[PDB]
Design a protein around this ligand. Sequence first.
Ligand SMILES: *[C@@H]1O[C@H](CO)[C@@H](O[C@@H]2O[C@H](CO)[C@@H](O)[C@H](O)[C@H]2NC(C)=O)[C@H](O)[C@H]1NC(C)=O
Ligand SMILES: *[C@@H]1O[C@H](CO)[C@@H](O[C@@H]2O[C@H](CO)[C@@H](O)[C@H](O)[C@H]2NC(C)=O)[C@H](O)[C@H]1NC(C)=O
Ligand SMILES: *[C@@H]1O[C@H](CO)[C@@H](O[C@@H]2O[C@H](CO)[C@@H](O)[C@H](O)[C@H]2NC(C)=O)[C@H](O)[C@H]1NC(C)=O
Ligand SMILES: *[C@@H]1O[C@H](CO)[C@@H](O[C@@H]2O[C@H](CO)[C@@H](O)[C@H](O)[C@H]2NC(C)=O)[C@H](O)[C@H]1NC(C)=O
Ligand SMILES: *[C@@H]1O[C@H](CO)[C@@H](O[C@@H]2O[C@H](CO)[C@@H](O)[C@H](O)[C@H]2NC(C)=O)[C@H](O)[C@H]1NC(C)=O
Lengths: 49, 109
Amino acid sequence: AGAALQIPFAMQMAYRFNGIGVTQNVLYENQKLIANQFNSAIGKIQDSL
Amino acid sequence: KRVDFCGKGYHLMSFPQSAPHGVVFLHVTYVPAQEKNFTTAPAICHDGKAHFPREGVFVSNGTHWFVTQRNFYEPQIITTDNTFVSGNCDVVIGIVNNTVYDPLQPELD
Ligand SMILES: *[C@@H]1O[C@H](CO)[C@@H](O[C@@H]2O[C@H](CO)[C@@H](O)[C@H](O)[C@H]2NC(C)=O)[C@H](O)[C@H]1NC(C)=O
Ligand SMILES: *[C@@H]1O[C@H](CO)[C@@H](O[C@@H]2O[C@H](CO)[C@@H](O)[C@H](O)[C@H]2NC(C)=O)[C@H](O)[C@H]1NC(C)=O
Ligand SMILES: *[C@@H]1O[C@H](CO)[C@@H](O[C@@H]2O[C@H](CO)[C@@H](O)[C@H](O)[C@H]2NC(C)=O)[C@H](O)[C@H]1NC(C)=O
Ligand SMILES: *[C@@H]1O[C@H](CO)[C@@H](O[C@@H]2O[C@H](CO)[C@@H](O)[C@H](O)[C@H]2NC(C)=O)[C@H](O)[C@H]1NC(C)=O
Ligand SMILES: *[C@@H]1O[C@H](CO)[C@@H](O[C@@H]2O[C@H](CO)[C@@H](O)[C@H](O)[C@H]2NC(C)=O)[C@H](O)[C@H]1NC(C)=O
């Protein structure tokens, strides 16, 4: 919607969780679990393909 | 609310006009500009507790910390009503020390 604006990834995940009703407090205290789950899911989908 | 359905950017209005065999829309859009650089932080540690912003983001101009909304720069002093506490800060990554003012204590004096 205009010019690109820099933003850290964690503060973008916080916004994206806040958008769907889950408060941003959940993300900043469960970051490693989310990262591990995402990596495992991407590995599984790569292997499935 | 869907992005880029009608107009490039945030949507405000629309006006229909006729044509010989069709319709013409004059969308009205809002676009930000004249950006700046700033240093952020995800949470504030004070008195052993962690304060998070309600709807906004923490910023700092180098020597002081404010809270501002996402789409427009309007600094405000951090208080205990626009920030909410959640647990103790020992696991969050990116914590920075600071002080949070409250109105009740100076008010009572
Ligand atoms: C929520 O679910 C996740 C994943 O199902 C749980 O994390 C697992 O915890 C077990 C036990 O400590 C570990 O062996 C696994 O390696 C963990 N998985 C991952 C991806 O880290 C988590 O404990 C669950 N939380 C609650 C409160 O039930
Ligand atoms: C915020 O700071 C960054 C880095 O100091 C700026 O990025 C540079 O912008 C200049 C503009 O002429 C480019 O020539 C450089 O190549 C940029 N750096 C890099 C690493 O690509 C950025 O422009 C600043 N923000 C604003 C709004 O000016
Ligand atoms: C960051 O912003 C603060 C808040 O305005 C600045 O502190 C004030 O700066 C003005 C001058 O611009 C002084 O007249 C005031 O006395 C300062 N203090 C207060 C409480 O208003 C600060 O100088 C800014 N720092 C930088 C590096 O820009
Ligand atoms: C942002 O990135 C910088 C550099 O990648 C991090 O700074 C490093 O922090 C570690 C410990 O967290 C230190 O051991 C390094 O010496 C630091 N390096 C530099 C160049 O400062 C910083 O911690 C990162 N911040 C967040 C919130 O992740
Ligand atoms: C924020 O403040 C805390 C406590 O005031 C600091 O934690 C102590 O820092 C000193 C010096 O760096 C250490 O000797 C202590 O062991 C630390 N822990 C305690 C319980 O006192 C902390 O370093 C400050 N800065 C940040 C980024 O958290």
